[PDB]
Amino acid sequence: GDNKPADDLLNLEGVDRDLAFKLAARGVCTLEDLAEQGIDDLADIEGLTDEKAGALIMAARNICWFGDEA
Amino acid sequence: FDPILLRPVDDLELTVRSANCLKAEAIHYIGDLVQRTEVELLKTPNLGKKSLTEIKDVLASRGLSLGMRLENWPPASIADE
């Protein structure tokens, strides 16, 4: 599966195309799916660190919970 | 002193995964859970979407995660002993 990152995950701030591809390789496709992943699930990829992986989880979740506000 | 708070998050009938989430923050006694508000916890990645569900289950008992605030931890009930 190409596992291409959705515009939401690719348009996520703090993440580059390379990081978006690695995260998408885990079946994740939309920024929301990325939030579903946990810091332990992000550790699966060495490119992502437990600290960087957690920062991406809250960032993605914040976009969904705070998505109502521009 | 609420016995659910004194009990170790590991004692939670839920799988260790539930306690592993909060425990990951250096928490061993559910009491610390009431010390921090769920919001402060939802602001951390250490928690997983599934972990949140387990919290709601225990929160249903209203015994822990009631948004309480403790100056230290041991309530007048525990007293010196």
UniProtKB/Swiss-Prot annotation, chain A:
<comment type="subunit">
    <text>Monomer. Binds directly to the core enzyme of the DNA-dependent RNA polymerase (RNAP). Interacts with nascent RNA. Interacts with the termination Rho factor. Interacts with the phage lambda N protein. Interacts with SuhB via the AR2 domain, crystallizes as a 2:1 SuhB:NusA heterotrimer. The rRNA transcription and antitermination complex (rrnTAC) consists of RNAP, NusA, NusB, NusE (rpsJ), NusG, SubB, ribosomal protein S4, DNA and precursor rRNA; S4 is more flexible than other subunits. NusG and the alpha-CTD of RNAP interact with the AR2 domain.</text>
</comment>
<feature type="repeat" description="2">
    <location>
        <begin position="14"/>
        <end position="64"/>
    </location>
</feature>
<comment type="function">
    <text>Part of the processive rRNA transcription and antitermination complex (rrnTAC). The complex forms an RNA-chaperone ring around the RNA exit tunnel of RNA polymerase (RNAP). It supports rapid transcription and antitermination of rRNA operons, cotranscriptional rRNA folding, and annealing of distal rRNA regions to allow correct ribosome biogenesis. Participates in both transcription termination and antitermination. Involved in a variety of cellular termination and antitermination processes, such as Rho-dependent transcriptional termination and intrinsic termination.</text>
</comment>
<protein>
    <recommendedName>
        <fullName>Transcription termination/antitermination protein NusA</fullName>
    </recommendedName>
</protein>
<comment type="subunit">
    <text>(Microbial infection) Interacts (via N-terminus and AR2 domain) with Escherichia phage lambda antitermination protein Q; this interaction (AR2 domain) releases the autoinhibition of NusA.</text>
</comment>
<comment type="similarity">
    <text>Belongs to the NusA family.</text>
</comment>
<feature type="region of interest" description="Acidic repeat 2 (AR2), required for interaction with SuhB, interacts with RNAP subunit alpha (rpoA), NusG">
    <location>
        <begin position="2"/>
        <end position="70"/>
    </location>
</feature>
Curated annotation (Swiss-Prot), chain B:
<comment type="similarity">
    <text>Belongs to the RNA polymerase alpha chain family.</text>
</comment>
<feature type="modified residue" description="ADP-ribosylarginine">
    <location>
        <position position="17"/>
    </location>
</feature>
<comment type="function">
    <text>DNA-dependent RNA polymerase (RNAP) catalyzes the transcription of DNA into RNA using the four ribonucleoside triphosphates as substrates. This subunit plays an important role in subunit assembly since its dimerization is the first step in the sequential assembly of subunits to form the holoenzyme.</text>
</comment>
<feature type="region of interest" description="Alpha C-terminal domain (alpha-CTD); not required for RNAP assembly or function">
    <location>
        <begin position="1"/>
        <end position="81"/>
    </location>
</feature>
<feature type="modified residue" description="N6-acetyllysine; by PatZ">
    <location>
        <position position="50"/>
    </location>
</feature>
<protein>
    <recommendedName>
        <fullName>DNA-directed RNA polymerase subunit alpha</fullName>
    </recommendedName>
</protein>
<comment type="subunit">
    <text>Homodimer. The RNAP catalytic core consists of 2 alpha, 1 beta, 1 beta' and 1 omega subunit. When a sigma factor is associated with the core the holoenzyme is formed, which can initiate transcription. Both the N- and C-terminus interact with different regions of transcriptional regulator CRP. The rRNA transcription and antitermination complex (rrnTAC) consists of RNAP, NusA, NusB, NusE (rpsJ), NusG, SubB, ribosomal protein S4, DNA and precursor rRNA; S4 is more flexible than other subunits.</text>
</comment>
<feature type="modified residue" description="N6-acetyllysine">
    <location>
        <position position="49"/>
    </location>
</feature>
<comment type="function">
    <text>Part of the processive rRNA transcription and antitermination complex (rrnTAC). The complex forms an RNA-chaperone ring around the RNA exit tunnel of RNAP. It supports rapid transcription and antitermination of rRNA operons, cotranscriptional rRNA folding, and annealing of distal rRNA regions to allow correct ribosome biogenesis.</text>
</comment>
